[PDB]
Paper text:
Aldo-keto reductases (AKRs) are a superfamily of oxidoreductases capable of reducing carbonyl to primary and secondary alcohols, found in all phyla. In this work, we identify the enzyme AKRtyl, which is responsible for tylosin reduction. Phylogenetic analysis indicates that AKRtyl is the founding member of subfamily D within family 12 in the AKR superfamily. Specifically, by combining steady-state and transient kinetics, X-ray crystallography and molecular dynamics simulation, we demonstrate that AKRtyl exhibits a positive synergy mediated by an unusual Monod-Wyman-Changeux (MWC) paradigm of allosteric regulation at low concentrations of the cofactor NADPH, but an inhibitory effect at high concentrations is observed.
Further, we added 1.2-times NADPH during AKRtyl crystallization, and the structure shows that the octamer exhibits an all-liganded active state (R4-N4R4-N4). Combined with other liganded states (R4-N2T4, R4-N4T4, R4-N1 R4-N1 as shown in Supplementary Fig. 13c–e), we find that the structure of the tetramers always exhibit symmetrical features. (2) The tetramer has structural symmetry in different ligand states (unliganded, partially liganded, fully liganded).
Author numbering:
A (entry chain A), B (entry chain H), C (entry chain B), D (entry chain C), E (entry chain D): 1 to 331
Write the structure that this text describes.
Amino acid sequence: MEYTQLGRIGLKVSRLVLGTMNFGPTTDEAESHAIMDAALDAGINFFDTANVYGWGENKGRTEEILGSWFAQGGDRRDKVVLATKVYGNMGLDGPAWPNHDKLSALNIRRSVDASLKRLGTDHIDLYQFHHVDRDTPWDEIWQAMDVLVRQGKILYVGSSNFAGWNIAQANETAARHGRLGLVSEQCLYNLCERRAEMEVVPAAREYGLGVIAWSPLHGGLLGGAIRKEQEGGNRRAASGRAADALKDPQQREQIQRYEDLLDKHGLEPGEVALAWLLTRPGVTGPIVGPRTADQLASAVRAAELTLTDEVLTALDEIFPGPGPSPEAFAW
Amino acid sequence: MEYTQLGRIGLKVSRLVLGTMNFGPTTDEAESHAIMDAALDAGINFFDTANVYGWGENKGRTEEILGSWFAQGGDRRDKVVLATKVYGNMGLDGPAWPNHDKLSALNIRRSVDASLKRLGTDHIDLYQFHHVDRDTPWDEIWQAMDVLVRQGKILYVGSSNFAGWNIAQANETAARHGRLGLVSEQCLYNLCERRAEMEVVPAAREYGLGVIAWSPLHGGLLGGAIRKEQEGGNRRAASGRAADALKDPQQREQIQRYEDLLDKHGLEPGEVALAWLLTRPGVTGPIVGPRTADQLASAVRAAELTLTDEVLTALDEIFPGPGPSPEAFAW
Amino acid sequence: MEYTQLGRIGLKVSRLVLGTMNFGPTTDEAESHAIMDAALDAGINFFDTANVYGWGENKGRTEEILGSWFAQGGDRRDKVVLATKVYGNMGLDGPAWPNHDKLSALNIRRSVDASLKRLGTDHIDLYQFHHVDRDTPWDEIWQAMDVLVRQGKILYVGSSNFAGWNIAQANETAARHGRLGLVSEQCLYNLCERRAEMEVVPAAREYGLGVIAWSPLHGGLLGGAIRKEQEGGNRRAASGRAADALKDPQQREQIQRYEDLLDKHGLEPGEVALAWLLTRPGVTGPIVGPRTADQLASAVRAAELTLTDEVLTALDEIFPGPGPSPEAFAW
Amino acid sequence: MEYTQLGRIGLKVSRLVLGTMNFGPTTDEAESHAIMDAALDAGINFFDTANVYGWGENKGRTEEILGSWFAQGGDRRDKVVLATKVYGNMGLDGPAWPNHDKLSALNIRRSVDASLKRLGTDHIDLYQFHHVDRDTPWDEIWQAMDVLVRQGKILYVGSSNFAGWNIAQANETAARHGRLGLVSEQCLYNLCERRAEMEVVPAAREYGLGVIAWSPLHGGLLGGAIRKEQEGGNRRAASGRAADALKDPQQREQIQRYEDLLDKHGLEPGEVALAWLLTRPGVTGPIVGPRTADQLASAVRAAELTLTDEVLTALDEIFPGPGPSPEAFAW
Amino acid sequence: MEYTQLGRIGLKVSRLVLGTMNFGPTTDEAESHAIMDAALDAGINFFDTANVYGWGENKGRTEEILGSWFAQGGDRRDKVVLATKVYGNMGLDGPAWPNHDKLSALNIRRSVDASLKRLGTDHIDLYQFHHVDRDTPWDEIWQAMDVLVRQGKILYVGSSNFAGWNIAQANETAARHGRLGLVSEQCLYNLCERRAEMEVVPAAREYGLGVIAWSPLHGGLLGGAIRKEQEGGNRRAASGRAADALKDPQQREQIQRYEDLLDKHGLEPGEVALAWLLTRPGVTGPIVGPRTADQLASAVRAAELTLTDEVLTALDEIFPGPGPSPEAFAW
Ligand SMILES: NC(=O)c1ccc[n+]([C@@H]2O[C@H](COP(=O)([O-])OP(=O)(O)OC[C@H]3O[C@@H](n4cnc5c(N)ncnc54)[C@H](OP(=O)(O)O)[C@@H]3O)[C@@H](O)[C@H]2O)c1
Ligand SMILES: NC(=O)c1ccc[n+]([C@@H]2O[C@H](COP(=O)([O-])OP(=O)(O)OC[C@H]3O[C@@H](n4cnc5c(N)ncnc54)[C@H](OP(=O)(O)O)[C@@H]3O)[C@@H](O)[C@H]2O)c1
Ligand SMILES: NC(=O)c1ccc[n+]([C@@H]2O[C@H](COP(=O)([O-])OP(=O)(O)OC[C@H]3O[C@@H](n4cnc5c(N)ncnc54)[C@H](OP(=O)(O)O)[C@@H]3O)[C@@H](O)[C@H]2O)c1
Ligand SMILES: NC(=O)c1ccc[n+]([C@@H]2O[C@H](COP(=O)([O-])OP(=O)(O)OC[C@H]3O[C@@H](n4cnc5c(N)ncnc54)[C@H](OP(=O)(O)O)[C@@H]3O)[C@@H](O)[C@H]2O)c1
Ligand SMILES: NC(=O)c1ccc[n+]([C@@H]2O[C@H](COP(=O)([O-])OP(=O)(O)OC[C@H]3O[C@@H](n4cnc5c(N)ncnc54)[C@H](OP(=O)(O)O)[C@@H]3O)[C@@H](O)[C@H]2O)c1
């Protein structure tokens, strides 16, 4: 396993981050536990989850599944850098009761306690804002996070779905009063969606945040979804983001040229998409979303893959990116 | 003439900013002087220029044309908020001698003295960085600008062609030591190019910066370029940014839709493109680029236009924007 | 003559401040100079003026009258604490040209140089904001005033017509970065108008500001205006603030009881109104507004007067005050 | 017993520091307890240990031996300034699992709780970084240590095996936000290795850190290891740093001239090496590493020794040092 | 010519720095002027000098030689980053009159004015402390430098012959109050003397200082001095640092190994020693000290040299370095 520092901080993480969103609604508990043990066996020490994972009536299920995994012993908790999230409504889906979503100090207090209980642990290593909350100012947010740091309930704070200027404002505010700022940003970044290159990744690099890419396969769309389109099973690529893209002709053409490109070179689409993120400057790693143990082993092979300059140049022509602002739209 | 504060600061400006880029390479000194006289007569108090305007061997020409205008007296200098720019290479076009472009304290010192000399004035009201310089840190930049403030050579500092996160870093750094930060950002923003909406204008709004939109007509492309395409004269729409667009079938189709829409509503294309910027949240105003006194009078009418909701919705249809990050590309 | 520190600072001032607003529009130059000579002879070392004094086409005349008085030599400038003001429109009466009124760094730059030219002096001791400007933030204002301090063009900064919370925000902002804040507030305070007791004077006292009361006779209303009502001449009491009040039966009765009370006690109404202000806690002193040299001598006698508890109690009955907020309107 | 302040802080310490590295792997529990009772009887109030001491499969053993010593009662814990360390891998020897070594907030949290449990105490008086960790920034480190300070788990923070500029950076960062910085540096310093004089000790003295010298006899080499080379026993000088130095004829000769010089002066080599350290400016004292009660008594005699200038000169000729940078290598 | 940023700041400099110490005592004025024109022609934009250069009764002569060079016109001053130095005694050689050497605010004021006059310029781009002054505190030094920055007499401040911890203390102190810190350290660093690697270069790199190496050929010792040993000319290698080294058998043996090695590879000793420094991480460049225009051309060739791994390995065996502290002397 390749390791790296999480941005500027002293925390060392595997360059594959184990995502757990499938655990519960797509992968059942026993298989979820098998994936996590396999992940630890391959040297992955960085697990991402969220309080909302499980979905609908089953929100919190994923954190519970991790909690029973930890309760097996064997230094599982001690070996894992455990990350979860606050922002989402944990009540009935639909409009939330006021302050039962977003980032008020009130919702931060109640959300972290509920996550700690479900996870069966006295601390979260990386507590992440699931999304920017424009209505909560940074002196309120850092007040609340600092309470948790001092109480030993969290170690580090991270962001997710921030704009680049939110990262700058957050960490400048933290720095003025001696607080450790955001240590990482979890943003949507993959071959199909590269606009985090404009400002999110540049701001993260300047401020020394790790960068971890969620939906690195665009929800399975980059996993060989065309070749597999008629297959059954409970596959994520049959729904949501991937199925939406495949209905659209120009995006379908993109994935078709992508799967054709990799047929020529004899490479696997899921593995190449992960390996491609590992080449992008500033990227700590993809957050892999295995549904099965074989998909985890596939991600592990993806981390050992070297893409040639030919393949990298060809991917760039199929999936151009904007580069940074202001050059991306001005000069 | 409608006035507004420039973002959060005490300076009041006309919502039309007079751009001077045409003065010299496209508009001669005599017509330039008349345009500026008409600008003052119409209540426009805010002029934008740059050291490099003039182009090629005539870099600095524009500042000199403004200087001979001020030298005529009549309270012209006292009435005008004078903005200019540093970053550009003022030597022979091509690779600059080291530190003769960009934002080192060395180049700021020599550039500001050259501009004051050409402009024939002892102070610049708004001194702007022409572009982000990723290699100069903000404590060096704010040191150099603070020397100029305390010497009385400049009043305010502004940015141009920044990323949103550069605005945040700049003003947070300035605030740690009680310096007035950036007061305005001058960015490309018009019907044709709306990606400043993702992060640049959001960051400017959070930090209380004015937002002044350069090339509000995309270089004359939105001024009725199709209807005018076969005309003679020294037209900006006949070259550069506008000519390249009218070559691409889809960008041309976009502009054809625009010109056809406005013919059904009795509106002029250049006036609508300016009036549209004036409706955008956080926009101080467009930096108009008249080539003729007639075109300046047209802009003054544009500032009095009220666009109906039907025209605004139709324009959104032809010229969609991305809105803010992270929603623009994630959720 | 009684001297006191101006609030918390080391400057020592006479408890009578010489107001000059009459000098020009009401008192001619010759007698203006006479009043100033007699003021200095009585030990008054603190003169208040403004760039706009003179009024209409003659704005700046008062400063020019002071200029020619200092020009006579005699250690006059060295012996006087010279205070003037920035904010007002120095152009034609009516809507001002943008940034030719208010408190932008731009208007501060141009106003102080024109005041120094008219006064014939290289520095102003106390440079006062004529009025709060809600559109200019304090980091911009303190930037501009710091330039003046460091250039030696001013010594101290004071306010006029501020709200109490403006005084707090201004001096907290200055203190943050090691600037000396406002040293004095010049507010309307007299027997007829006591609402400065609510917040302005409490905030001034908390922050250690001098308090100097403008129109201490309410524009002559408290100077015997009813007794003198039928006399001709260009008396201030005939017009403006005093005229309006006397046309109101409720306020006219107040003044009638006032003048009758002091007739019974053998006291002069002008002198009593000044002595009253000198008893108020936090008040440095009144800014007297003599129209004649006799009225100046009267002010000097007011500063030697001791008002009995009986007279003070009776004045309180005729001219009740609100006291401080929140008690003034809540509990 | 001579006492001194630990650098600039209020803590008073014996100029002999009791090192505990031998307790467990070299000296058994009952003899270790005997030495610690004798240390206290001698007035030594300052004990140094580490989580890793005990070595190999027995890491943590030394802390347990001190824990059983404290558990005897008798005001032993109340009388002792207890120092331990964080940084070392406490797992199986080899490369550590990520974040189970070094100075991340994660490893600091897990290491201190493990040490407190082994030591059987609720607080550590001096918690030391065992080595600089170049990948962890000082705002992460000080956040972590400040959590422990505010929870009462530690009192002071110290460093060990730092460069001089690490000390400066650490304490400047601490001071910015009012944290007490490093109070001591534990560095390798003895007659054989004097390069801490170049920058480590000068930086410590500038920032007012104590300087406590580890391996003061260079692992037993300066304790008469030539004369005793044929001796048997679990001797430290028979292995490690000392045995290496004697395999090398070039420094073997240095030890020979040293043992010869002290033969002539009737002095004990172990005692002289400690007494020499007590003469060095800025040195709090040496960390003695007795294997036996008798070597502790010998160290106590060493602290009462007076080395004549004759001997100091001769020692400085056998064992020259570089003095401070930049003079040590430039001018 | 290769260019690089000077550490973290926006200043771009040639990776060859032209040293001027030879100009005067070794190279006469005419050929000094020729070398400087040749340097500019080659694209070298960064000149180093000092007030004392000239030596003895001719101290200041080197600055005058640069002054007459600038006075020729030709954009010479505008194109050059001009560095000079303060600390040295400018009076009669011997013990200095108090405050006529070292870094008191008093000596800094008088030294900079003398240097500006001799240089014939109104500003120094990079004003450097010639040596650490342990007796002057950093708030005194930064006050003096800030006076010069705000007066426009200097732009940047640099250090020379500092210890690593001095760099840290200097820049932390500067940053506390918004001052730009040291931008560069000028230290002795070459194949013969590598102890700047222990702590000076690491501190410089951490704090983002440029590193410019003085006497990069060890005063000519590395320029072929054994092969040239019996030659005439006013050769720097015939005296001083290089001559004393060739006296010592161990040191002479090292240079012999060097020259013999390069004969086997068809490389020149002066050029290799320069090219070697350009490979060292964190080194901005060597400060070349040509005696002739031919030696300047040879340095320019050295900047285009690529040293093979074989040669770099062989040089490291001849000229081992200590690497960073604490590992250099501890672990
Ligand atoms: N911060 C946020 O807003 C956010 C949002 C979403 C996710 N996340 C995090 O990012 C993690 C991953 O997101 P994701 O599940 O959407 O990632 P993804 O990799 O885009 O999608 C997962 C799907 O890709 C396929 N796949 C996975 N590994 C593969 C492989 N080695 N080869 C071929 N196909 C493979 C599987 O598709 P099939 O099922 O069709 O076989 C799998 O269910 C989540 O677990 C969560 O921790 C964060
Ligand atoms: N900060 C930067 O990087 C940057 C870059 C560019 C410009 N600027 C600034 O922004 C200012 C404006 O830039 P620009 O000149 O490109 O503006 P623009 O308005 O996009 O282009 C100017 C052209 O639009 C046409 N036009 C202007 N006013 C019109 C009207 N009322 N009705 C119809 N057509 C009209 C004319 O084209 P025809 O000649 O074809 O008639 C005119 O020459 C410049 O003067 C400069 O100050 C800044
Ligand atoms: N900061 C602001 O916004 C502001 C506003 C107004 C004034 N000020 C300052 O405050 C100063 C005083 O204002 P003001 O002129 O309105 O003062 P005032 O004392 O309220 O009114 C002046 C008039 O009162 C009469 N008077 C003056 N002294 C007298 C005395 N000893 N006995 C009897 N009557 C006397 C005269 O009225 P008759 O002519 O009827 O005899 C005189 O013209 C001004 O000079 C100016 O410096 C500041
Ligand atoms: N921070 C770090 O990196 C680090 C590293 C090492 C140590 N330390 C600390 O520094 C302490 C001392 O280290 P150390 O054990 O290596 O010290 P040391 O004094 O250099 O070596 C100990 C050995 O010196 C001999 N000795 C001790 N006292 C003597 C005396 N009075 N007369 C003659 N010989 C004597 C004994 O050797 P024989 O057994 O051969 O008789 C003893 O085992 C440790 O206990 C530990 O607390 C810290
Ligand atoms: N901050 C300080 O304390 C300090 C101290 C000293 C110097 N400096 C600065 O560092 C600069 C350089 O120092 P330095 O003069 O001692 O440099 P140096 O390069 O170590 O010594 C100069 C000598 O090396 C020889 N040489 C130079 N270039 C050569 C080449 N391309 N090929 C072969 N030989 C070459 C010449 O020796 P021969 O004459 O024998 O031919 C020349 O006189 C000085 O000018 C000064 O700016 C600073």
